[PDB]
Amino acid sequence: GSVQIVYKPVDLSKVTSKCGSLGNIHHKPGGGQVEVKSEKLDFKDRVQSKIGSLDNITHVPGGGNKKIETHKLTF
Amino acid sequence: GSVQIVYKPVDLSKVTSKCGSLGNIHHKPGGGQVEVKSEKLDFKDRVQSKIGSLDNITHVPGGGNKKIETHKLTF
Amino acid sequence: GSVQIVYKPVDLSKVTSKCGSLGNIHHKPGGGQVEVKSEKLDFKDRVQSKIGSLDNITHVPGGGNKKIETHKLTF
Amino acid sequence: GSVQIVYKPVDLSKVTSKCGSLGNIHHKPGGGQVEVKSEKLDFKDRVQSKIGSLDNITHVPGGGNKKIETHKLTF
Amino acid sequence: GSVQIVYKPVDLSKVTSKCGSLGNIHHKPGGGQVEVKSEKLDFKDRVQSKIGSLDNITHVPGGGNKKIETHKLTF
Amino acid sequence: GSVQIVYKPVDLSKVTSKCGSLGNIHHKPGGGQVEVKSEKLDFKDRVQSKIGSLDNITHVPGGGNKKIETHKLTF
Amino acid sequence: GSVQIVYKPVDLSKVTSKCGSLGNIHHKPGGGQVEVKSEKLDFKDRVQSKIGSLDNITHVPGGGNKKIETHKLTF
Amino acid sequence: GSVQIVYKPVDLSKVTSKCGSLGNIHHKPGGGQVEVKSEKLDFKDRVQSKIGSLDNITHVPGGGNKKIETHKLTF
Amino acid sequence: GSVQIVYKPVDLSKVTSKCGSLGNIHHKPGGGQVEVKSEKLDFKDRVQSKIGSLDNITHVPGGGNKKIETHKLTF
Amino acid sequence: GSVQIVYKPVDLSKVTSKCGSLGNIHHKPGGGQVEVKSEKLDFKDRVQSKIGSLDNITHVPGGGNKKIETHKLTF
Amino acid sequence: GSVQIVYKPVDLSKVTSKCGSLGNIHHKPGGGQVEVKSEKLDFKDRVQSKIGSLDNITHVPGGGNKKIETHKLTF
Amino acid sequence: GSVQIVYKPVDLSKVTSKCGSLGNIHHKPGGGQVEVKSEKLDFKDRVQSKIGSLDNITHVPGGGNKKIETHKLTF
């Protein structure tokens, strides 16, 4: 008498992660038409101002891919 | 007498995550038509201001992919 | 006498996650037509102001994919 | 006697033209769920056919911008 | 006696043309789920066919911008 | 007696033309999930077929910008 | 007993095909009698015109002859 | 007993194909009598014109002859 | 007993193909009688023209003759 | 005193003669289809006969062109 | 005193004669299709016959061109 | 005193004659398709015949061109 065994599992799967700011930004202040223009700014004590500025702030403690796998046969 | 065994599970799945700011932004203040223009700013004491500014703030814990799998055969 | 066994489950599934801000933004204050214009800002004490301004705050815990699976045969 | 003349017409206009195909289309045939599917096509003699398709062709004669202007002063 | 003349017409205009294929199309045939799928095709004599397809062709005469201007002063 | 003349027409304009194929197409045939798939194509005599395809062709006469201008002063 | 067999089908045919442009055309513009003639032609901008012309273009994939024949005797 | 067989099918045929441009054209512009003649042509910008011309082009993807024949005797 | 077989199929046919441009054209522009003649032609910018011309081009993918024949005798 | 003479008559005429039988001849008796052919003719004594025959008889005196002309100047 | 003479008549005319039969002949009797052929003719005494024949008979005196001219100047 | 003479008549004319038979002949009797062939003719005493024959007979006196010209100047 006799025995015959074949053992061969297969993994062909695929996995993706994408994280953070993935978009697009278009910013354009003051693109007008004017004949005569005049601007006068006067700032004194502990003043703060932002005029036509852009701040992009991104951080990502996230995001890993992880796998644990175990195979065994005994006879 | 005889015995015959074949063991082969298969994984062909696919997995995706996308996280955070995924949109698109268009910003354009003050793009007019004017003959005569005048702007006068006078700021004195502990003043804060924003004029035409863009702030994008993004953060992302998590957003990962995790798999655990275990196989055995015994005879 | 004899025995004959075949063992092969299969996974062909797919999974998707999309999380956060997904829209599109269009913002455009002050794009008019005027002959004569004058603007006059006068701030003394502890003023906070925003004339036209855009900010996007996005944050996203979780949003991930998790799978656990186990197979055994005993004969 | 004396004379003083000042001559200054001004143009501050804007002009735009957009021509052709600008719209939005969504088309998605046959995207179902079924256990067993079979298809059996047999086309013999001078046959014309279309299955799940879209046609886009564009001609633009027109759509330009034109201006003519004249200025005269005689003393 | 005396005379003084000042002559200064001004142009501040802007002009734009966009012509042809600018829109949005989404097309996605056959994107289903099935266990068993079979297809037999048999095309014999003077056969023309389209399956799952999209056609894009563009011609643009015109779309241009043109300006003519004349200035005269005679004393 | 005396005369003084000042002559200074000014042009500050801007002009744009864009012509042809600029829009968005998304095309994706056959993107499904299946366990068993078979296809059997049998074509004979004067057969023309398109399966899953996309065609792109562009011709542009015109789209140009043209300006003519003349100035004359006579004393 | 006895048998005698004679087998002789006969074909004496003729077959003809003529395809495309076979007809008769007479064209003869401007063939007159005149004492004095003068012609002034002045074309500026994006003009198309025709005077006294003839167009001949021919496509023929078709028009062939085909025959299939089979003979069998079994004793 | 006895047998005699005679087997002699006969083909005496003829077959013809003629394809494309076979017809008759007569063309004769301008053929007059005149004492004084003058022609003045002034063509400036993006003009196309035809005067007294003839165009001849031919494509023939087929027009062929084909025959298939089979003979069998079995005793 | 006895048997006698005679086997002799015969082919005496004829086959012809002619493809392309075979017909008759007569062309004769301008063929008059005149005492005084003048022609003045003045062409500037991106102009195309034809005067009294003839164009001839031919392509032939088809037009062949094909025969297949088989004979079998078994005793 | 003085005398000034110029003498120049001009001939630009054209003349044509065409005379007789103006065609081309096509003749084809007996081109039929028949299974079995037999025809019976019995002529004894001084018979004359014509069957399917063509006689073309043409003759042309004259038909020519003649011109006679004379010039003189005397002083 | 003085005398000035110029003498120059001119002939630019043209003359044509065509007479008789100049055409083309096609003759083809008896080109039919027949299985079995026989014809029976019995002619005995001083018989004349024509069957399917072509006679073309042409003759042409004259048809020529003649010109006579004379010039003189006497002083 | 003085005299000035110039004497120069000019001939640029042209003359054509065509007379007789100049053509092309195609003759082809008896080119048929037949399985079995026979013809029976019995002619005895002073018989004449022609069957499918071609006779072409041409003769042409004249057809020529003649010119006579004479010039003189006397002083």
Residue numbers in the entry:
A (entry chain A), B (entry chain C), C (entry chain B), D (entry chain E), E (entry chain F), F (entry chain D), ...: 304 to 378
From the study:
Abundant filamentous inclusions of tau are characteristic of more than 20 neurodegenerative diseases that are collectively termed tauopathies. Six tau isoforms that range from 352 to 441 amino acids in length are expressed in adult human brain from a single gene by alternative mRNA splicing. Tau filaments consist of a structured core made mostly of the repeat domain, with less structured N- and C-terminal regions forming the fuzzy coat. Here, we report in vitro assembly conditions with recombinant tau that replicate the structures of filaments from both Alzheimer’s disease (AD) and chronic traumatic encephalopathy (CTE), as determined by cryo-EM.
